Design an enzyme around this catalytic site. Structure first.
Site, PDB file in Angstrom:
ATOM      1  N   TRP A  96       9.276  28.716  42.190  1.00 58.07           N
ATOM      2  CA  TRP A  96       9.391  27.293  41.914  1.00 58.07           C
ATOM      3  C   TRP A  96       8.568  26.441  42.883  1.00 58.07           C
ATOM      4  N   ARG A 104       4.497  14.356  34.427  1.00 56.68           N
ATOM      5  CA  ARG A 104       3.296  15.135  34.170  1.00 56.68           C
ATOM      6  C   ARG A 104       3.417  16.501  34.841  1.00 56.68           C
ATOM      7  N   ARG A 156       6.874  27.845  33.155  1.00 52.93           N
ATOM      8  CA  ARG A 156       8.152  28.498  33.384  1.00 52.93           C
ATOM      9  C   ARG A 156       9.069  28.641  32.173  1.00 52.93           C
TER      10      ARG A 156
HETATM   11  C1  FAD Z   1       3.878  33.947  34.673  1.00 50.27           C
HETATM   12  C2  FAD Z   1       3.362  33.556  36.048  1.00 50.27           C
HETATM   13  C3  FAD Z   1       2.818  34.597  36.940  1.00 50.27           C
HETATM   14  C4  FAD Z   1       2.323  34.240  38.268  1.00 50.27           C
HETATM   15  N1  FAD Z   1       1.834  35.254  39.093  1.00 50.27           N
HETATM   16  C5  FAD Z   1       1.360  34.948  40.383  1.00 50.27           C
HETATM   17  C6  FAD Z   1       0.858  35.976  41.299  1.00 50.27           C
HETATM   18  O1  FAD Z   1       0.823  37.175  41.006  1.00 50.27           O
HETATM   19  N2  FAD Z   1       0.404  35.540  42.588  1.00 50.27           N
HETATM   20  C7  FAD Z   1       0.420  34.165  42.995  1.00 50.27           C
HETATM   21  O2  FAD Z   1       0.007  33.863  44.115  1.00 50.27           O
HETATM   22  N3  FAD Z   1       0.894  33.216  42.153  1.00 50.27           N
HETATM   23  C8  FAD Z   1       1.366  33.549  40.870  1.00 50.27           C
HETATM   24  N4  FAD Z   1       1.880  32.537  40.004  1.00 50.27           N
HETATM   25  C9  FAD Z   1       1.878  31.161  40.591  1.00 50.27           C
HETATM   26  C10 FAD Z   1       0.618  30.406  40.119  1.00 50.27           C
HETATM   27  O3  FAD Z   1      -0.539  30.968  40.743  1.00 50.27           O
HETATM   28  C11 FAD Z   1       0.761  28.896  40.495  1.00 50.27           C
HETATM   29  O4  FAD Z   1       0.832  28.765  41.938  1.00 50.27           O
HETATM   30  C12 FAD Z   1       2.050  28.272  39.907  1.00 50.27           C
HETATM   31  O5  FAD Z   1       2.088  28.429  38.496  1.00 50.27           O
HETATM   32  C13 FAD Z   1       2.082  26.797  40.219  1.00 50.27           C
HETATM   33  O6  FAD Z   1       1.142  26.107  39.247  1.00 50.27           O
HETATM   34  P1  FAD Z   1       0.119  25.018  39.324  1.00 50.27           P
HETATM   35  O7  FAD Z   1      -0.963  25.288  40.271  1.00 50.27           O
HETATM   36  O8  FAD Z   1      -0.448  24.792  37.980  1.00 50.27           O
HETATM   37  O9  FAD Z   1       0.962  23.789  39.763  1.00 50.27           O
HETATM   38  P2  FAD Z   1       0.985  22.695  40.891  1.00 50.27           P
HETATM   39  O10 FAD Z   1       0.743  23.409  42.212  1.00 50.27           O
HETATM   40  O11 FAD Z   1       2.228  21.876  40.853  1.00 50.27           O
HETATM   41  O12 FAD Z   1      -0.197  21.903  40.447  1.00 50.27           O
HETATM   42  C14 FAD Z   1      -0.230  21.079  39.158  1.00 50.27           C
HETATM   43  C15 FAD Z   1      -1.697  20.678  38.774  1.00 50.27           C
HETATM   44  O13 FAD Z   1      -2.396  20.026  39.839  1.00 50.27           O
HETATM   45  C16 FAD Z   1      -3.441  20.993  40.083  1.00 50.27           C
HETATM   46  N5  FAD Z   1      -3.689  21.304  41.403  1.00 50.27           N
HETATM   47  C17 FAD Z   1      -2.733  21.211  42.416  1.00 50.27           C
HETATM   48  N6  FAD Z   1      -3.239  21.563  43.500  1.00 50.27           N
HETATM   49  C18 FAD Z   1      -4.539  21.920  43.353  1.00 50.27           C
HETATM   50  C19 FAD Z   1      -5.602  22.390  44.167  1.00 50.27           C
HETATM   51  N7  FAD Z   1      -5.397  22.572  45.473  1.00 50.27           N
HETATM   52  N8  FAD Z   1      -6.859  22.647  43.557  1.00 50.27           N
HETATM   53  C20 FAD Z   1      -7.090  22.456  42.191  1.00 50.27           C
HETATM   54  N9  FAD Z   1      -6.125  22.005  41.314  1.00 50.27           N
HETATM   55  C21 FAD Z   1      -4.854  21.747  41.934  1.00 50.27           C
HETATM   56  C22 FAD Z   1      -3.871  21.569  38.651  1.00 50.27           C
HETATM   57  O14 FAD Z   1      -4.429  20.871  37.532  1.00 50.27           O
HETATM   58  C23 FAD Z   1      -2.383  21.973  38.420  1.00 50.27           C
HETATM   59  O15 FAD Z   1      -2.108  22.577  37.131  1.00 50.27           O
HETATM   60  C24 FAD Z   1       2.356  32.807  38.744  1.00 50.27           C
HETATM   61  C25 FAD Z   1       2.902  31.806  37.827  1.00 50.27           C
HETATM   62  C26 FAD Z   1       3.400  32.132  36.522  1.00 50.27           C
HETATM   63  C27 FAD Z   1       3.943  30.984  35.690  1.00 50.27           C
HETATM   64  C1  FAD Z   2     -12.584   9.023  28.630  1.00 50.76           C
HETATM   65  C2  FAD Z   2     -11.683   8.599  29.781  1.00 50.76           C
HETATM   66  C3  FAD Z   2     -11.019   7.290  29.708  1.00 50.76           C
HETATM   67  C4  FAD Z   2     -10.157   6.840  30.799  1.00 50.76           C
HETATM   68  N1  FAD Z   2      -9.563   5.578  30.700  1.00 50.76           N
HETATM   69  C5  FAD Z   2      -8.743   5.106  31.739  1.00 50.76           C
HETATM   70  C6  FAD Z   2      -8.116   3.783  31.708  1.00 50.76           C
HETATM   71  O1  FAD Z   2      -8.264   2.987  30.777  1.00 50.76           O
HETATM   72  N2  FAD Z   2      -7.306   3.417  32.825  1.00 50.76           N
HETATM   73  C7  FAD Z   2      -7.087   4.281  33.950  1.00 50.76           C
HETATM   74  O2  FAD Z   2      -6.372   3.899  34.874  1.00 50.76           O
HETATM   75  N3  FAD Z   2      -7.673   5.495  33.988  1.00 50.76           N
HETATM   76  C8  FAD Z   2      -8.492   5.947  32.940  1.00 50.76           C
HETATM   77  N4  FAD Z   2      -9.119   7.222  33.010  1.00 50.76           N
HETATM   78  C9  FAD Z   2      -8.848   7.990  34.268  1.00 50.76           C
HETATM   79  C10 FAD Z   2      -7.681   8.966  34.050  1.00 50.76           C
HETATM   80  O3  FAD Z   2      -6.479   8.220  33.930  1.00 50.76           O
HETATM   81  C11 FAD Z   2      -7.606   9.939  35.278  1.00 50.76           C
HETATM   82  O4  FAD Z   2      -7.342   9.176  36.482  1.00 50.76           O
HETATM   83  C12 FAD Z   2      -8.931  10.718  35.479  1.00 50.76           C
HETATM   84  O5  FAD Z   2      -9.281  11.440  34.305  1.00 50.76           O
HETATM   85  C13 FAD Z   2      -8.773  11.712  36.619  1.00 50.76           C
HETATM   86  O6  FAD Z   2      -8.060  12.920  36.064  1.00 50.76           O
HETATM   87  P1  FAD Z   2      -6.955  13.831  36.529  1.00 50.76           P
HETATM   88  O7  FAD Z   2      -5.689  13.159  36.824  1.00 50.76           O
HETATM   89  O8  FAD Z   2      -6.718  14.878  35.521  1.00 50.76           O
HETATM   90  O9  FAD Z   2      -7.555  14.469  37.825  1.00 50.76           O
HETATM   91  P2  FAD Z   2      -7.209  14.669  39.336  1.00 50.76           P
HETATM   92  O10 FAD Z   2      -6.673  13.351  39.859  1.00 50.76           O
HETATM   93  O11 FAD Z   2      -8.370  15.233  40.073  1.00 50.76           O
HETATM   94  O12 FAD Z   2      -6.106  15.678  39.176  1.00 50.76           O
HETATM   95  C14 FAD Z   2      -6.317  17.102  38.672  1.00 50.76           C
HETATM   96  C15 FAD Z   2      -4.960  17.773  38.236  1.00 50.76           C
HETATM   97  O13 FAD Z   2      -3.974  17.697  39.263  1.00 50.76           O
HETATM   98  C16 FAD Z   2      -2.992  16.858  38.614  1.00 50.76           C
HETATM   99  N5  FAD Z   2      -2.447  15.847  39.370  1.00 50.76           N
HETATM  100  C17 FAD Z   2      -3.107  15.215  40.436  1.00 50.76           C
HETATM  101  N6  FAD Z   2      -2.368  14.338  40.918  1.00 50.76           N
HETATM  102  C18 FAD Z   2      -1.179  14.273  40.272  1.00 50.76           C
HETATM  103  C19 FAD Z   2       0.019  13.520  40.346  1.00 50.76           C
HETATM  104  N7  FAD Z   2       0.150  12.572  41.271  1.00 50.76           N
HETATM  105  N8  FAD Z   2       1.053  13.803  39.421  1.00 50.76           N
HETATM  106  C20 FAD Z   2       0.942  14.790  38.448  1.00 50.76           C
HETATM  107  N9  FAD Z   2      -0.174  15.582  38.290  1.00 50.76           N
HETATM  108  C21 FAD Z   2      -1.223  15.293  39.223  1.00 50.76           C
HETATM  109  C22 FAD Z   2      -2.971  17.289  37.067  1.00 50.76           C
HETATM  110  O14 FAD Z   2      -2.619  18.558  36.501  1.00 50.76           O
HETATM  111  C23 FAD Z   2      -4.501  17.001  37.015  1.00 50.76           C
HETATM  112  O15 FAD Z   2      -5.135  17.271  35.738  1.00 50.76           O
HETATM  113  C24 FAD Z   2      -9.931   7.708  32.014  1.00 50.76           C
HETATM  114  C25 FAD Z   2     -10.610   9.013  32.049  1.00 50.76           C
HETATM  115  C26 FAD Z   2     -11.462   9.473  30.988  1.00 50.76           C
HETATM  116  C27 FAD Z   2     -12.101  10.840  31.164  1.00 50.76           C
HETATM  117  O1  UMP Z   3       6.190  34.868  37.894  1.00 49.63           O
HETATM  118  C1  UMP Z   3       5.728  34.642  39.019  1.00 49.63           C
HETATM  119  C2  UMP Z   3       5.181  35.651  39.882  1.00 49.63           C
HETATM  120  C3  UMP Z   3       4.696  35.292  41.087  1.00 49.63           C
HETATM  121  N1  UMP Z   3       4.679  33.949  41.604  1.00 49.63           N
HETATM  122  C4  UMP Z   3       4.095  33.638  42.940  1.00 49.63           C
HETATM  123  C5  UMP Z   3       5.462  33.403  43.629  1.00 49.63           C
HETATM  124  C6  UMP Z   3       5.251  34.054  45.072  1.00 49.63           C
HETATM  125  O2  UMP Z   3       4.580  33.106  45.935  1.00 49.63           O
HETATM  126  C7  UMP Z   3       4.298  35.233  44.882  1.00 49.63           C
HETATM  127  C8  UMP Z   3       4.992  36.561  44.557  1.00 49.63           C
HETATM  128  O3  UMP Z   3       6.047  36.325  43.578  1.00 49.63           O
HETATM  129  P1  UMP Z   3       6.957  37.470  42.996  1.00 49.63           P
HETATM  130  O4  UMP Z   3       6.226  38.143  41.915  1.00 49.63           O
HETATM  131  O5  UMP Z   3       7.294  38.424  44.055  1.00 49.63           O
HETATM  132  O6  UMP Z   3       8.181  36.837  42.447  1.00 49.63           O
HETATM  133  O7  UMP Z   3       3.530  34.778  43.690  1.00 49.63           O
HETATM  134  C9  UMP Z   3       5.213  32.888  40.793  1.00 49.63           C
HETATM  135  O8  UMP Z   3       5.231  31.726  41.133  1.00 49.63           O
HETATM  136  N2  UMP Z   3       5.707  33.313  39.536  1.00 49.63           N
END
Ligand code: FAD
Ligand code: FAD
Ligand code: UMP
Ligand code: FAD
Ligand code: FAD
Ligand code: UMP
Ligand code: UMP
Ligand code: UMP
Lengths: 221, 219, 218, 218
Positions: free
Chosen positions: A77, A166, A175
């Protein structure tokens, strides 16, 4: 507070929420220097946002949950970085006898060399022995932060989780899916149920146009 | 709840909503020891303790949503704060109204210039009027909005929603409620601090006394 | 690598850490493994992309140096998962560098004013605003105040450090027809450099994860 | 660069993008400038650190390979501004590697039983838990369920990509006496590697911004 029981001793409780479906509507409309219109046009906007990938408006809806879950579930988580957490500490707190003991039905579908009942009993024995040792160490003067290293991953912990809609939808995509461990899937279903009740339009639109998992499409609430 | 503070000549900062309060941080901090709230006195004391020692994560559970109207040059600086959520008025999609920040002569109150300060205000208003008329002519002629607006100056007002937690908000105040920041955003930061103080008095006072790094709030 | 964009802009690659193999290694650690063979490893990258395993790509990081108009930079900087350092109008005396669209920018639109006339009108504003800016600074007005009269087409410069996962999100949103044409051009340059440094990741991305349209057509 | 930690752990540097000069280049862009000379550039690093201008340091990025006990990793992974990929207990069969504190770990504490016996008791539980784990796996019990009986001192392995700004936050919090001793050891190793790759930044950090205590003692 809405509180849903999970596993054998766990739970998910909603602590607070800021915003609702209309919050996302207003945040989207500001783009055109507009605000809310009508319940009909507004619900339609949510659907449009969801199907076209306009995700930022949903960041203005924020939830705070209170969760009790096994450490192995929490480890997964807490990998969700876009959120805030505060958790019970084993360095500072004397730990209670609270562990997740899976029922025999947890092994349903798998062929085992031994009865599922035996596995459950085997896990229970390890828990008892480990916790007994933990207590013996602490009573003997061993610092808490050291004594707890003998405790198993099924020990329950507790934490507060604040997350926006989001990031919560990303959590559900990952999950509330059959590839995720069954135990966290159960927690994701509870999270989804609470999400559905507080943001019905967002939740419905999410399931119809953006959700990439499987279980929420085969399981009611 | 709701609060609104006017800034500059046509701007404002409005509080839309808030989740949590000082007790939210107390509760988040206490979970470490498997406890909850205690007493009004021990709790406020815990808040000062967290601030003094840098225990900042408990404050992330307090979240604010603001509605802001500010000049684009101020918004550019503001939006550099990444740990927050934004949604802003779009010049690609919306027809823009005649709303610009025209500084009063007092803005230069302290600087010796060749021409009268009154002249500066005049020069700015003149270029603004010219640029806006050009923008309108282009729009009226069928030029797409996204292209026509590139001739508009940085003092054009924009509007946006800002959702931010107390920890990131404190960082914002450390950097913007400071004499090194541009005066215009200092004004907005003061309004943000004013609202923060009203909703989370314990956290704000503790912040000011033990963690605030800026100067204008202590004056 | 440097690519010229618009009339005076550019995208230049400053540094890069990691490559396609960085993602492979990060993925294999799950099973306590590392690299295998050129064939198995590329198949793994495709596997990761197809199934949405995105975190391994966060270990590939790029640093770009970009010169773009402020209205483009405003949209770019909305991408929060990245690092930025930009030229300051509060501290630096600004040069006469503005983006002036060529008439061709209006192809497809029927305007009451000839396209060439639009270019001229924009140039006029730029010149009058910049002259006003210079007059103010020369008179004694602080830079941070004098620059408020400058138009959104003024060029700025910045360093951008971003990992491959965030970069792919940037391409999904900006290398798309719904994005403003000007930023689409920058996105295409960013894509080209990405492709050059991480061909396997880029190809896999285009085949299974890219949600935009222009990279499919260009 | 690889440093052994605890009884079976380690911290290894895998890759690094940038160096002290990357922060200088990033900072100078504010005034539309680049690098100057050693003396001036080192001086700028100190100025940035002294006045709290932290964003330029985000352009220096490190990738580490770490092997640490789960209870240490749980604390480490709370640092969200970074990227992680870790060994999985759901997918891989776990090896017999655990952190068994040596008697010296209890030096300074008053216990009723000899420290060596504490070490012995921990080893006993570890042995029993692991045996139980193996028994379950060989009986057909899914790995993801069997591993729940394993203790928190089991070693895991992960890749960690983090920029210098976040790395400095990690050192302020973990290279400090209030942090658990075990993670302090890892932080000291991370600090040594940081010092070798970015000496100017590390020195300025220790002199003007470091809030911990141990790095000023060691
Ligand atoms: C079925 C399953 C198997 C998995 N197995 C493994 C495993 O074997 N080993 C392991 O280490 N982990 C594993 N994970 C964990 C996985 O790698 C992610 O850390 C976890 O799903 C958290 O997701 P997230 O990065 O999308 O979310 P968040 O960390 O909450 O991020 C949400 C969004 O913000 C983004 N974002 C946040 N931080 C960054 C960043 N620094 N750079 C670029 N984008 C960013 C992306 O758009 C992302 O989707 C697993 C997860 C699942 C669901
Ligand atoms: C065609 C177009 C039109 C748009 N029009 C408008 C408009 O009218 N007004 C306006 O304000 N913006 C507008 N935007 C900007 C848009 O709202 C986003 O700010 C922009 O696309 C940056 O994207 P992102 O959030 O995915 O990326 P990043 O900020 O780089 O984030 C990457 C990933 O991490 C995540 N993430 C990062 N921060 C957070 C957070 N705090 N909470 C949850 N998830 C997070 C998500 O998974 C995300 O995709 C527009 C963009 C495009 C491409
Ligand atoms: O389903 C999964 C498997 C792995 N992990 C990330 C969690 C731990 O940081 C590390 C190892 O997880 P376990 O597989 O041991 O649960 O990778 C997840 O978030 N979800
Ligand atoms: C007086 C003043 C002058 C300035 N001059 C310039 C200038 O000339 N050029 C310029 O480009 N900018 C300039 N800035 C902007 C500055 O570089 C920051 O972008 C701005 O202050 C936002 O701050 P922040 O990073 O602390 O906040 P946020 O982006 O909101 O981040 C909050 C916290 O999370 C962190 N964090 C967020 N993202 C990351 C990440 N990717 N890596 C590591 N830690 C992270 C840090 O602990 C940070 O303090 C100036 C700001 C001020 C106040
Ligand atoms: C001695 C010690 C004892 C601890 N005890 C406990 C405990 O009992 N319980 C517990 O739950 N945790 C505990 N922690 C963990 C602590 O709460 C932090 O999660 C941990 O230090 C990671 O720090 P960070 O948030 O500063 O870093 P990162 O998560 O890496 O963030 C770096 C910077 O970006 C910021 N930032 C990142 N995300 C956000 C966000 N969502 N909102 C606002 N700012 C953000 C801040 O400026 C931050 O300093 C402890 C840590 C230490 C060092
Ligand atoms: O006080 C300042 C100066 C600069 N910047 C960031 C904002 C822009 O992204 C870029 C240049 O800003 P100006 O100096 O032109 O305002 O650097 C700020 O956030 N605050
Ligand atoms: O295509 C777009 C349109 C808008 N915005 C964000 C950028 C600004 O913060 C604000 C207004 O942008 P303009 O439409 O004026 O470009 O919304 C983008 O990122 N991309
Ligand atoms: O020194 C500490 C104490 C706690 N925690 C965070 C880590 C876990 O998420 C939770 C409980 O940690 P333990 O005290 O049990 O190690 O709080 C840390 O990061 N560092």
């Amino acid at each position: 507070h809405m509180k849903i029981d999970i596993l054998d001793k766990g739970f998910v409780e909603l602590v607070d929420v800021m915003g609702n479906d209309l919050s996302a509507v207003r945040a989207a409309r500001v783009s055109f220097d507009m605000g809310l219109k009508d319940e009909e046009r507004d619900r339609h906007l949510i659907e449009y946002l969801m199907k076209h990938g306009h995700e930022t408006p949903f960041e203005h809806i924020v939830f705070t949950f209170h969760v009790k879950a096994p450490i192995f579930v929490a480890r997964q988580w807490f990998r969700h970085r876009i959120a805030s957490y505060n958790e019970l500490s084993g360095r500072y707190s004397k730990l209670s006898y609270e562990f997740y003991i899976p029922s025999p039905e947890r092994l349903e579908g798998y062929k085992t060399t031994i009865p599922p009942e035996r596995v459950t009993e085997k896990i229970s024995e390890i828990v008892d022995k480990a916790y007994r040792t933990y207590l013996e160490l602490i009573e003997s003067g061993v610092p808490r932060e050291v004594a707890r290293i003998v405790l198993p991953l099924n020990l329950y912990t507790r934490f507060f989780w604040t997350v926006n809609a989001r990031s919560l939808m990303n959590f559900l995509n990952l999950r509330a899916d059959s590839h995720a461990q069954w135990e966290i899937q159960q927690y994701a279903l509870a999270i989804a149920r609470i999400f559905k009740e507080k943001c019905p339009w967002t939740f419905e639109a999410f399931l119809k146009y953006a959700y990439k998992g499987d279980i929420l499409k085969e399981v009611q609430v």
